[PDB]
Amino acid sequence: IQTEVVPPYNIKTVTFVQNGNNVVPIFELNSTFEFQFDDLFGNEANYYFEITHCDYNWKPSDIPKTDYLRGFDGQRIMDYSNSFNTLQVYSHYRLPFPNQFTTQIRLSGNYILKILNEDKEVVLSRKFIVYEEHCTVGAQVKRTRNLSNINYKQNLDFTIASNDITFQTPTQNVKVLLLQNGNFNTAIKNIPPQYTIGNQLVYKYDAETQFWGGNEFLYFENKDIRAANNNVGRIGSNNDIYNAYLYTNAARGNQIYTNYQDVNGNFVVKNINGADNSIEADYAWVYFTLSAPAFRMNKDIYITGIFNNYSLSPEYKMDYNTDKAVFEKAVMIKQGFTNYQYTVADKKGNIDLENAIDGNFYQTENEYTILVYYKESIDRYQRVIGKGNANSINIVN
């Protein structure tokens, strides 16, 4: 039962804030966190949540939910704040997971939160992982071997040396998931170890574990809406919430890498003039724009970041404007520093990382994550026995 994400329409700005700033869903076994999302109605609706353990391939594991929880699932989100003193009225929902109802999440592994809306209907659903600490995933990006795909590829090599979990059948038990930045769609998963030189596995080859480099994320920071801040020129208020027009981006694949730093997708909801940035930020129709004259195919350029789960709904599809030969689309987005990127999609879900409209430069600063699933053949679920983060500011060729 490959239960997958479900993108909403009203709800926007769905994230997993932990320790303040947003994060990727990968969580520790007892680390607290939230699921801040925002409804675009003054309707103080009732959003009942759920949680489900899941397998490697996201088939819902057959554990009883009294086993991977202690508490309840379907109970409406108590805490929520309304958009205070803003043009786009919205209801900021929020729920900490070590809360009153589900007083903790007591099993590592995959999960899937559901935000079914007041009857049973799943509005949305995000995936996260609660990794336990028993291995020592020693990873490091490093340039590939094949000279052709070396200027725009980032091989990833590492080991798993645990002195806590003696692996039974490491070729068949220890499955691994590799994440490029925080994305779940481009994970390079289902990889068997090469060596197993002892109690420790070792993954070394350059066939499977090889991510496309991908250039750096673009951004824009409309701290104050009516400003003229970072590449948001011609901000115009017209009979609506504000409109933030962005400078026409240019395809960077046909160019050389230029050191251009980002925070790898994450946005920062924020404003000046605001006490609490969560309920006091203001949505604003931002008009994106892509000038890629070399790009000519039958695939669709979708906008993508961390604010929208790297999703590919039709409410992010760039649109060719023959009057200018320039893609363009409006996307309502909360204020603050926001990263994004133009990811082509095949037509349905196939991303086609190569031939991306931005580039694949091997030296871009990506932060790769590695999750080590594991399932003894007496256990009733796939644990997660340690993650190892290793980014590409250390491409040790």
Binding site: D224, A228, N229, G233
Partner: peptide, 12 residues
């Protein structure tokens, strides 16, 4: 064709 537009804000 020097197509460049300076922007920004200042408050005191």
């Amino acid at each position: 064709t020097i197509d460049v537009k300076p922007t920004g804000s200042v408050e005191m």
